[PDB]
Amino acid sequence: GMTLEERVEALEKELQKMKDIEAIKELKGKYFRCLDGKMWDELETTLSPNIVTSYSNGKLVFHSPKEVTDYLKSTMPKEEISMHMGHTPEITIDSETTATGRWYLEDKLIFTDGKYKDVGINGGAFYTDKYEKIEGQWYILETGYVRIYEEHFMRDPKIHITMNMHK
């Protein structure tokens, strides 16, 4: 049998894992919230300085938080309402400072003014993320996904958007 000190040490480490998992869920919650509400400075804080991830089906690859936030902002203008809704996460602590997470995303885009007015886009994806921990704080390091489906369509003009945090 193990000593008390040994059992406490075990509890310390096991609890740290549970704490790290909550922190990662909280991280990803912030990420979506800041993205869909276009608080770009805040969003930048969720990203590792060592970040490397890609977009436009691998056509574009970015190497810092600045670079990524700048880019997302370009694809998410005022005219575009975004909802990126995360579900049923599967988080795994790979080491004391690294982790992997799967997420299930429903997404929804609605254009209100500008050149793509009334265009609607809906879909789903299985994201897989990598995270890393730096000075006691978790950060997103890599994000990749598999598309479940994507549908593009013209919305009915007779639909009235009665409230909008962006207009």
78 binds a second copy (CB under 8 A): no
- Contact predicate 39/27, CB 8 Å: no
Pick left, alpha or beta for residue 10 (phi over 0 → left; psi -120 to 50 → alpha; otherwise beta). alpha
Smallest gap from Cβ 33 to Zn ion, in A, equals 15
CA max distance for the chain: 72
The answer to whether 16 and 9 are in contact (CB under 8 A) is no
d(CA 55, CA 61): 6
- Map the footprint of Zn ion across residues 64-123, applying CB under 5 A: 85
Among 85, 113, 114, 144, binds a second copy (CB under 8 A): 85
Q: Which residue in 24, 32, 47, 72 binds a second copy (CB under 8 A)? A: 32
Candidates 33, 64, 73, 76; binder of a second copy (CB under 8 A) is 33
Chosen residue from 24, 68, 110, 140 binding a second copy by CB under 8 A: 110
Which chain residues interact with Zn ion by CB under 5 A? 85
